[PDB]
Design a protein around this ligand. Structure first.
Ligand SMILES: COc1ccccc1C(=O)Nc1cc2c(cc1N1CCNC[C@H]1C)n(C)c(=O)n2C
Length: 109
């Protein structure tokens, strides 16, 4: 499934391009944010997702979109509304939605 993996890789880069601050580029570093696991049960970030993609752990679009969504939702859930992080997650949901919709469309032809 390289036709599919070509699409996901491009789609992942497109999503990651929307992260203009590199807020979601690597995991929330748990040593630096020791209460993060108290609120967030399933952390996610673009580096992890790249590893999963390249390790063949995303069979279908849904399992890929799942992780992307965790990135957004974790961030909305952990950070106060009046934070740059929360605002970045609001943006990324809006902007990633379009990328994801077009990519699902491209899959179908
Ligand atoms: C690599 O990040 C750090 C390095 C040194 C000290 C602290 C951090 C850190 O806490 N970064 C961080 C925390 C986040 C966070 C993102 C970061 N980082 C900002 C800088 N880029 C790396 C990214 C993981 N998000 C989205 C979030 O909800 N939280 C709590």
């Amino acid at each position: 499934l390289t036709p599919f993996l070509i699409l996901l890789r491009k789609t992942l880069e497109q999503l990651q391009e929307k992260d203009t601050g590199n807020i979601f580029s690597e995991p929330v570093p748990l040593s630096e944010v020791p209460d993060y696991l108290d609120h967030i049960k399933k952390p996610m970030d673009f580096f992890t997702m790249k590893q999963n993609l390249e390790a063949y752990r995303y069979l279908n679009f849904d399992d890929f979109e799942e992780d992307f969504n965790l990135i957004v939702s974790n961030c909305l859930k952990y950070n106060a509304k009046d934070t740059i992080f929360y605002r970045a997650a609001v943006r990324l949901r809006e902007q990633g939605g379009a990328v994801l919709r077009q990519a699902r469309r491209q899959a179908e032809k």
